[PDB]
RNA sequence: GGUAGUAUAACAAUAUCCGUGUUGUUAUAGUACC
């Protein structure tokens, strides 16, 4: 691997989750290394992911919440 | 003076459950590095 394929994580979440909420935590830093932690809320379970910039944060959250809440989609 | 990052905004392409995302190009600004 190298160029990865996070598009998979995004779409996969969308599939399992036709409607949910994304919310941001942290997001502060020196000036050029901002830490963003975006957490996704599904069915009352909230999973948090930390990325530099907005990209990876929500992404990683999607991955987590996927493996997680698929055990309780209702 | 030059180099760089982050953020906001616009356009296009790509994928798409049309909701959204990824990618590419451009513009503006504090700061950081030399």
UniProtKB/Swiss-Prot annotation:
Residues 10-15, 31-32 are annotated as: Interaction with substrate RNA. Brain and peripheral tissues. Residues 5-71 form the DRBM domain. Catalyzes the hydrolytic deamination of adenosine to inosine in double-stranded RNA (dsRNA) referred to as A-to-I RNA editing. Homodimer. Homodimerization is essential for its catalytic activity. Can form heterodimers with isoform 5 of ADAR/ADAR1. It comes from Rattus norvegicus. This is Double-stranded RNA-specific editase 1. The gene is Adarb1. It is found in: Nucleus; Nucleus, Nucleolus. Changing residue 55 to A: Reduced RNA editing activity.
């Amino acid at each position: 691997p190298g160029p990865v394929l996070p598009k998979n994580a995004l779409m996969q979440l969308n599939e399992i989750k036709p409607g949910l909420q994304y919310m941001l935590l942290s997001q502060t830093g020196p000036v050029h290394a901002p830490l963003f932690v975006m957490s996704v809320e599904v069915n009352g379970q909230v999973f948090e992911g930390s990325g530099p910039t907005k990209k990876k944060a929500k992404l990683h959250a999607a991955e987590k919440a996927l493996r997680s809440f698929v055990q309780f989609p209702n």
